[PDB]
Design a protein around this ligand. Structure first.
Ligand SMILES: CN(CC(=O)N1CCCCC1)S(C)(=O)=O
Length: 185
């Protein structure tokens, strides 16, 4: 792909984070803590899952960023509407305002309803995410495999401003403590 020149500097919004997350001082990394991180509750925090939003809002144009997923067993990545549900249980779907892919139990899937199997020969250590607001496209790229395409959501109906979306995943196994990291431009 040749989307690299639309690179944007994403930072994480602490106020949206689940209360167990630890976001680095530079707001570029996030990991699961082993306990509640001693913050007040608010209506923006994702309550049931270890999720956090980027601070940036996009309503036009072309945007690109990269995320490091090295040695994680589970995670979700993509974009979502600014007005997605924060509290309780929900599925990641375009009907609920999410355009995402994930790793779970040794398989990769796109967050359609129902979910779609992905075909990845080289497990990625970094993921590229491209959004074309006007075209209604969200695409995912395997940076470890020379930028190969993972998945394209087309005919997207965003229906609002978009925010970068992250889930570090649960750490029931003791094998999923590693962080998500926003990679430098
Ligand atoms: C289920 N987790 C503990 C927990 O209750 N929380 C952390 C995750 C978000 C909800 C809050 S664990 C064992 O760390 O994956």
């Amino acid at each position: 792909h040749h989307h690299h020149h639309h690179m944007v500097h994403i930072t994480l919004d602490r106020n949206t984070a689940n209360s167990w997350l630890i976001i680095s001082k530079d707001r570029r990394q996030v990991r699961m803590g082993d306990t509640h991180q001693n913050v007040s509750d608010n209506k923006e925090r994702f309550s049931n899952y270890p999720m956090v939003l980027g601070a940036q809002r996009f309503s036009s144009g072309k945007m690109y960023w990269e995320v490091d997923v090295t040695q994680k067993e589970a995670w979700d990545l993509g974009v979502c509407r600014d007005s997605v549900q924060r509290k309780g249980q929900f599925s990641l779907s375009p009907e609920n305002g999410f355009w995402t892919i994930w790793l779970w139990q040794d398989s990769y899937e796109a967050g359609t309803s129902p979910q779609t199997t992905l075909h990845i020969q080289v497990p990625p250590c970094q993921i590229g995410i491209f959004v074309d607001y006007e075209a209604g496209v969200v695409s995912f790229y395997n940076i470890t495999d020379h930028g190969s395409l993972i998945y394209t959501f087309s005919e997207c109906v965003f229906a609002g401003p978009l925010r970068p979306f992250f889930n570090v995943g649960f750490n029931y196994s003791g094998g999923n403590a590693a962080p998500l990291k926003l990679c430098p431009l």
